[PDB]
Amino acid sequence: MPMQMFMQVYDEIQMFLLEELELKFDMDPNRVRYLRKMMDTTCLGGKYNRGLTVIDVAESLLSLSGARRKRVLHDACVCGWMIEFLQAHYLVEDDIMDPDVTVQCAINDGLLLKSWTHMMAMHFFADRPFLQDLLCRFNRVDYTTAVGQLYDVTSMFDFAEFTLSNYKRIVKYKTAYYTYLLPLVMGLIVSEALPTVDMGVTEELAMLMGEYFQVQDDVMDCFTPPERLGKVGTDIQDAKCSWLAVTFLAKASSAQVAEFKANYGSGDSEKVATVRRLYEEADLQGDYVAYEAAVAEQVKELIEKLRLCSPGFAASVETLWGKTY
Amino acid sequence: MPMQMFMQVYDEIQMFLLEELELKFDMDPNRVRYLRKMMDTTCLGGKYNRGLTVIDVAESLLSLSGARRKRVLHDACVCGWMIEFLQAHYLVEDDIMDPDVTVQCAINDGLLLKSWTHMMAMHFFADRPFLQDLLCRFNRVDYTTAVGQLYDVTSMFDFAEFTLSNYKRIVKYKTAYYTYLLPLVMGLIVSEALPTVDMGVTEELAMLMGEYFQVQDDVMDCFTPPERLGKVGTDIQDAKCSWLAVTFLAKASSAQVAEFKANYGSGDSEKVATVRRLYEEADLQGDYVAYEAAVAEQVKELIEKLRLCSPGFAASVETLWGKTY
Ligand SMILES: Nc1cc(Nc2cccc(Cl)c2)ncn1
Numbered sequence A, B: 001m002p003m004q005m006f007m008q009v010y011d012e013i014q015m016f017l018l019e020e021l022e023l024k025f026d027m028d029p030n031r032v033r034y035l036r037k038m039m040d041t042t043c044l045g046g047k048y049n050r051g052l053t054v055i056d057v058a059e060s061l062l063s064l065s066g067a068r069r070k071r072v073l074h075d076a077c078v079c080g081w082m083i084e085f086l087q088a089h090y091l092v093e094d095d096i097m098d099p100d101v102t103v104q105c106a107i108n109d110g111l112l113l114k115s116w117t118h119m120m121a122m123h124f125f126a127d128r129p130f131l132q133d134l135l136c137r138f139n140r141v142d143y144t145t146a147v148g149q150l151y152d153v154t155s156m157f158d159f160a161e162f163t164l165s166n167y168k169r170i171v172k173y174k175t176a177y178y179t180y181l182l183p184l185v186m187g188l189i190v191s192e193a194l195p196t197v198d199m200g201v202t203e204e205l206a207m208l209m210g211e212y213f214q215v216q217d218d219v220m221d222c223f224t225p226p227e228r229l230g231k232v233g234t235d236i237q238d239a240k241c242s243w244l245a246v247t248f249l250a251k252a253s254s255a256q257v258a259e260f261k262a263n264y265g266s267g268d269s270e271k272v273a274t275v276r277r278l279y280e281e282a283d284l285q286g287d288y289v290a291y292e293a294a295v296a297e298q299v300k301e302l303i304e305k306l307r308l309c310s311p312g313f314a315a316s317v318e319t320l321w322g323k324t325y
């Protein structure tokens, strides 16, 4: 039922976008079908984690507060596809980083996906009192993610910024705002229960869960084999400010830091294996267990503070926290 | 006075954006000063044609309709920098088309410039009744420009689309909406005289002036020498659907079209000179004079229809039409 409606609203959104291009933007069928295929390729196929969270939050707030039900659930599905389209926009921008027409189309497709989030919001929410507030928080978080990518890209240029606090700054703006806080807030807005929740506890929860997932994501990028990860680990070669790097630099000797700096950020197969050897020989994945258990304990506590004033909202956050844990 | 205030509001806008990053987004001084230099490099230096049009329209409507004056003129300057920032966003996206960090920063800088148009609008216009309508028309035109770039990039893939009507479709969405119609509309919105103008005549004027400038721009891209153009002409090598190409294909023989198709879209110095030879030997720049005179006559007529209901607005359009003519 949740996924079956989420895909049904996708058909309704796509039909509006493509018909608007044909009827209002004077687009020929060849380019309409091309944009249909590009939309299905970049937006469909994933796990829809962010989009389904919006639907999960809106369900808990209408059942725990009738034509109002159909309106809120449909609005949540549109907001869910706004984030899914925004993630597709981010994925296209990543493909560009790594008279050529296929690059011109990739750049143009990234801008179209970003614009489609505005068009589907201006259309389905034209008669909603929260349209202006929804677009403001949406674009502010998109601005936050771009600022977060600047911290992540320039984390090794200006090892001075390889600290745990700066790691939290990167995860906060690069991941935590649009992956965890944005879907929760969009669920509160379509349910019109935005002023009925403690946003401080909610924001603090999103940062903790965002940081928890990133530490697990950094370890998998290093030790999980390529076939079991769905990609090829590249944080070592890219000299990324990962949780493993900042935790190593804090508990290593001068030679181990010297050997780390002489091997980190290189593409040689044996210099990367030397980095992994330094990670293994420091019992870092022992610190990984305790660090994650400490964060998970902080997640359980903040959910209870949020339930005293918003019970049904915390139930949907326990579901979101389960999909990460 | 017009430029002196336009640059003064730039300082006010930049100070808000950079302080917000320092105070709210936890940005260090090194990256704040970096974004200051990137902002000044991509946004300043140009002619500010689009931005100054917003100020030109707002002046004519308040004088021809007092703390209301300072509010409208300041709002027009902010809207002017919204388009100037949007143009800087488009210019950065063009540089990308033609672990490398300088490409990561370019892509990120393009997204930041686009987001800064939203942030400066959400801040200075937070208490304005037109904020939601301003953002909607702004993003819809940005979506229009991206659709226009798809028509221009794919104009030679699917010479079937090398027609005069399709040329008008490209110029309409790629150039005419955000270069001529957008600054005029933003001047009407900050002056709150949006429902007091014939938008059909206004839209038709922007398309005619946008198409007029593009034909002149296409000829200069071909015949104006590189030092007198500010760039290097590349429409022939890129196989662009220029006004010269579509006008040539309509009045050429079978061999001349065959020789055109065998030389167009190539980078050879002599194949491009063969294309220019075919353009010269067809008296195309004779058709250029008559075509531009016909468009200019249509511009003079539509201005008079618009003055019968909006006199002061037409005076600012005669000034904008003078900067193209
Ligand atoms: N001078 C320019 C540049 C430009 N760039 C642009 C705009 C929207 C989307 C994409 Cl992919 C590129 N569009 C029109 N005129």
Ligand SMILES: Nc1cc(Nc2cccc(Cl)c2)ncn1
Pocket: A090, A091, A093, A094, A145, A146, A149, A174, A175, B107, B108, B111
């Ligand atoms: N998986 C991703 C991708 C991603 N891309 C992105 C977002 C904003 C700006 C820029 Cl330049 C790139 N950001 C976070 N997570």
